[PDB]
Write a protein that binds this ligand. Sequence first.
Ligand SMILES: [Cu+]
Ligand SMILES: [Cu+]
Ligand SMILES: [Cu+]
Ligand SMILES: [Cu+]
Ligand SMILES: [Cu+]
Ligand SMILES: [Cu+]
Ligand SMILES: [Cu+]
Ligand SMILES: [Cu+]
Ligand SMILES: [Cu+]
Ligand SMILES: [Cu+]
Ligand SMILES: [Cu+]
Ligand SMILES: [Cu+]
Ligand SMILES: [Cu+]
Ligand SMILES: [Cu+]
Ligand SMILES: [Cu+]
Ligand SMILES: [Cu+]
Ligand SMILES: [Cu+]
Ligand SMILES: [Cu+]
Ligand SMILES: [Cu+]
Ligand SMILES: [Cu+]
Ligand SMILES: [Cu+]
Ligand SMILES: [Cu+]
Ligand SMILES: [Cu+]
Ligand SMILES: [Cu+]
Ligand SMILES: [Cu+]
Ligand SMILES: [Cu+]
Ligand SMILES: [Cu+]
Ligand SMILES: [Cu+]
Ligand SMILES: [Cu+]
Ligand SMILES: [Cu+]
Ligand SMILES: [Cu+]
Ligand SMILES: [Cu+]
Ligand SMILES: [Cu+]
Ligand SMILES: [Cu+]
Ligand SMILES: [Cu+]
Ligand SMILES: [Cu+]
Ligand SMILES: [Cu+]
Ligand SMILES: [Cu+]
Ligand SMILES: [Cu+]
Ligand SMILES: [Cu+]
Ligand SMILES: [Cu+]
Ligand SMILES: [Cu+]
Ligand SMILES: [Cu+]
Ligand SMILES: [Cu+]
Ligand SMILES: [Cu+]
Ligand SMILES: [Cu+]
Ligand SMILES: [Cu+]
Ligand SMILES: [Cu+]
Ligand SMILES: [Cu+]
Ligand SMILES: [Cu+]
Ligand SMILES: [Cu+]
Ligand SMILES: [Cu+]
Ligand SMILES: [Cu+]
Ligand SMILES: [Cu+]
Ligand SMILES: [Cu+]
Ligand SMILES: [Cu+]
Ligand SMILES: [Cu+]
Ligand SMILES: [Cu+]
Ligand SMILES: [Cu+]
Ligand SMILES: [Cu+]
Ligand SMILES: [Cu+]
Ligand SMILES: [Cu+]
Ligand SMILES: [Cu+]
Ligand SMILES: [Cu+]
Ligand SMILES: [Cu+]
Ligand SMILES: [Cu+]
Ligand SMILES: [Cu+]
Ligand SMILES: [Cu+]
Ligand SMILES: [Cu+]
Ligand SMILES: [Cu+]
Ligand SMILES: [Cu+]
Ligand SMILES: [Cu+]
Ligand SMILES: [Cu+]
Ligand SMILES: [Cu+]
Ligand SMILES: [Cu+]
Ligand SMILES: [Cu+]
Lengths: 119, 119, 119, 119
Amino acid sequence: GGVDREAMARCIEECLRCAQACTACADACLSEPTVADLTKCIRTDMDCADVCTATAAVLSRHTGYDANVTRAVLQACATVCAACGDECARAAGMAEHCRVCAEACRSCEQACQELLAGL
Amino acid sequence: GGVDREAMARCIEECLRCAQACTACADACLSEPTVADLTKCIRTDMDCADVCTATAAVLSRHTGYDANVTRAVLQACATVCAACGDECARAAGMAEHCRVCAEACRSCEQACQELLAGL
Amino acid sequence: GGVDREAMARCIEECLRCAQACTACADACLSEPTVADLTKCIRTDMDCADVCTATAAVLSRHTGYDANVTRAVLQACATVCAACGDECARAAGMAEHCRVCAEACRSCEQACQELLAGL
Amino acid sequence: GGVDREAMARCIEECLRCAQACTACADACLSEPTVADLTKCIRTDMDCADVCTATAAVLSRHTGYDANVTRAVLQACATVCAACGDECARAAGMAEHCRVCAEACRSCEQACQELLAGL
Ligand SMILES: [Cu+]
Ligand SMILES: [Cu+]
Ligand SMILES: [Cu+]
Ligand SMILES: [Cu+]
Ligand SMILES: [Cu+]
Ligand SMILES: [Cu+]
Ligand SMILES: [Cu+]
Ligand SMILES: [Cu+]
Ligand SMILES: [Cu+]
Ligand SMILES: [Cu+]
Ligand SMILES: [Cu+]
Ligand SMILES: [Cu+]
Ligand SMILES: [Cu+]
Ligand SMILES: [Cu+]
Ligand SMILES: [Cu+]
Ligand SMILES: [Cu+]
Ligand SMILES: [Cu+]
Ligand SMILES: [Cu+]
Ligand SMILES: [Cu+]
Ligand SMILES: [Cu+]
Ligand SMILES: [Cu+]
Ligand SMILES: [Cu+]
Ligand SMILES: [Cu+]
Ligand SMILES: [Cu+]
Ligand SMILES: [Cu+]
Ligand SMILES: [Cu+]
Ligand SMILES: [Cu+]
Ligand SMILES: [Cu+]
Ligand SMILES: [Cu+]
Ligand SMILES: [Cu+]
Ligand SMILES: [Cu+]
Ligand SMILES: [Cu+]
Ligand SMILES: [Cu+]
Ligand SMILES: [Cu+]
Ligand SMILES: [Cu+]
Ligand SMILES: [Cu+]
Ligand SMILES: [Cu+]
Ligand SMILES: [Cu+]
Ligand SMILES: [Cu+]
Ligand SMILES: [Cu+]
Ligand SMILES: [Cu+]
Ligand SMILES: [Cu+]
Ligand SMILES: [Cu+]
Ligand SMILES: [Cu+]
Ligand SMILES: [Cu+]
Ligand SMILES: [Cu+]
Ligand SMILES: [Cu+]
Ligand SMILES: [Cu+]
Ligand SMILES: [Cu+]
Ligand SMILES: [Cu+]
Ligand SMILES: [Cu+]
Ligand SMILES: [Cu+]
Ligand SMILES: [Cu+]
Ligand SMILES: [Cu+]
Ligand SMILES: [Cu+]
Ligand SMILES: [Cu+]
Ligand SMILES: [Cu+]
Ligand SMILES: [Cu+]
Ligand SMILES: [Cu+]
Ligand SMILES: [Cu+]
Ligand SMILES: [Cu+]
Ligand SMILES: [Cu+]
Ligand SMILES: [Cu+]
Ligand SMILES: [Cu+]
Ligand SMILES: [Cu+]
Ligand SMILES: [Cu+]
Ligand SMILES: [Cu+]
Ligand SMILES: [Cu+]
Ligand SMILES: [Cu+]
Ligand SMILES: [Cu+]
Ligand SMILES: [Cu+]
Ligand SMILES: [Cu+]
Ligand SMILES: [Cu+]
Ligand SMILES: [Cu+]
Ligand SMILES: [Cu+]
Ligand SMILES: [Cu+]
């Protein structure tokens, strides 16, 4: 109604790219000799993938749209992308895959925040 | 730390039961002759299943626990269970499966709210 | 080891695009005046999204790779993309969104089959 | 039609219990001092959770039922529960949580196999 269809499309594409980035990054950190120091990073990637996957699906549905549901789901996705971007950024010096995943998390956080701002 | 482990267990069990309830209820409303009047109900069941599935997974992980992430995910799950309980309750007179699913949604909403209250 | 890394990347990208296509197509058919005639289409889109989502995740993980697991998951994803491409193709005359989703299903079926063939 | 409704119900309940078991077991092995030796176990738990989640959803839908899709999805779930039961069984001496998860994987493998056998 008042919603930016382009910002909605961007959010959906970002959630799918970020979910896959975090799935791949959990697996990549799992395979590091350093894995013992990367456990919060792996766990946060797992959460971030689960929430981005759910958010992409909810935002993809227009039938019987409920702003309360959509707002609460975007907030959850913003919050986990922010936490996961921070955690991967701390591992960025130990692995190029975490630098890349941190960028994905930050990009998706911004896409959720931009949509959130428009209601 | 200050968290009720029993309330956490209840939330996880409720999310899985509620996700399956809503998957089954979307399918059941799809198969109703009335389906044309049950479209918001079906869509809300789809969202409610996706969010309960993600919430069960996030709450099942203790490594590198982040209260900000967990709070935002429980809020999203509470909000969608409340919306989906309301929508199925409106269809309760048209199908026994919606009365049952409304109860599941209300039960999981209360489990998320009770955990949320404890932080 | 003997695996085509490029075919693996293509499969992952196709599963995510196809999962979102089928989520959107279930929602689009839900919103059609015709919805009563589109119920198998909607149900198949739901399955196809769930299986493409799981397949993208499994194929994204290289740690402790098991060809038996990967083969069985690619087979499931091929089979549901084939069924869902066929079902959306039958609705293609009733809605442009089903023609588009049928193409996505066929594209992902071929990506899974091509990877399957390489083991 | 010829399907055991009770075996279908058991499969659905087992997939949800096994998905949560494997989510919890990935997290538990992540938190072990031994984590470096538990990486295949963690990865297999991640796959096993993703596939059990998708299988529970597909088996929960009766509208426009397709035996080809259902068979291929049950096969994938059987195969990953068998691989994940074996991998957790190897860690059973290092952690009680893996002994418990191995039992869940074996229980769900048998539920999928029993349904598969009935078509
Ligand atoms: Cu998004
Ligand atoms: Cu995201
Ligand atoms: Cu991500
Ligand atoms: Cu990583
Ligand atoms: Cu990491
Ligand atoms: Cu990470
Ligand atoms: Cu992440
Ligand atoms: Cu994420
Ligand atoms: Cu997201
Ligand atoms: Cu996010
Ligand atoms: Cu991260
Ligand atoms: Cu990384
Ligand atoms: Cu990372
Ligand atoms: Cu990331
Ligand atoms: Cu990451
Ligand atoms: Cu992320
Ligand atoms: Cu993200
Ligand atoms: Cu986002
Ligand atoms: Cu977003
Ligand atoms: Cu819960
Ligand atoms: Cu729930
Ligand atoms: Cu539910
Ligand atoms: Cu329903
Ligand atoms: Cu309903
Ligand atoms: Cu419903
Ligand atoms: Cu629901
Ligand atoms: Cu729910
Ligand atoms: Cu929940
Ligand atoms: Cu909920
Ligand atoms: Cu509902
Ligand atoms: Cu119902
Ligand atoms: Cu319902
Ligand atoms: Cu419900
Ligand atoms: Cu419901
Ligand atoms: Cu619900
Ligand atoms: Cu619920
Ligand atoms: Cu809940
Ligand atoms: Cu909850
Ligand atoms: Cu794929
Ligand atoms: Cu696919
Ligand atoms: Cu698709
Ligand atoms: Cu459609
Ligand atoms: Cu359709
Ligand atoms: Cu469809
Ligand atoms: Cu589809
Ligand atoms: Cu699919
Ligand atoms: Cu796929
Ligand atoms: Cu597929
Ligand atoms: Cu389709
Ligand atoms: Cu369509
Ligand atoms: Cu379609
Ligand atoms: Cu499709
Ligand atoms: Cu489709
Ligand atoms: Cu498809
Ligand atoms: Cu597909
Ligand atoms: Cu595919
Ligand atoms: Cu594929
Ligand atoms: Cu099952
Ligand atoms: Cu299972
Ligand atoms: Cu399991
Ligand atoms: Cu474990
Ligand atoms: Cu383990
Ligand atoms: Cu494990
Ligand atoms: Cu497992
Ligand atoms: Cu499993
Ligand atoms: Cu299963
Ligand atoms: Cu399984
Ligand atoms: Cu296992
Ligand atoms: Cu374990
Ligand atoms: Cu285990
Ligand atoms: Cu297990
Ligand atoms: Cu396990
Ligand atoms: Cu398992
Ligand atoms: Cu299992
Ligand atoms: Cu099973
Ligand atoms: Cu099963």
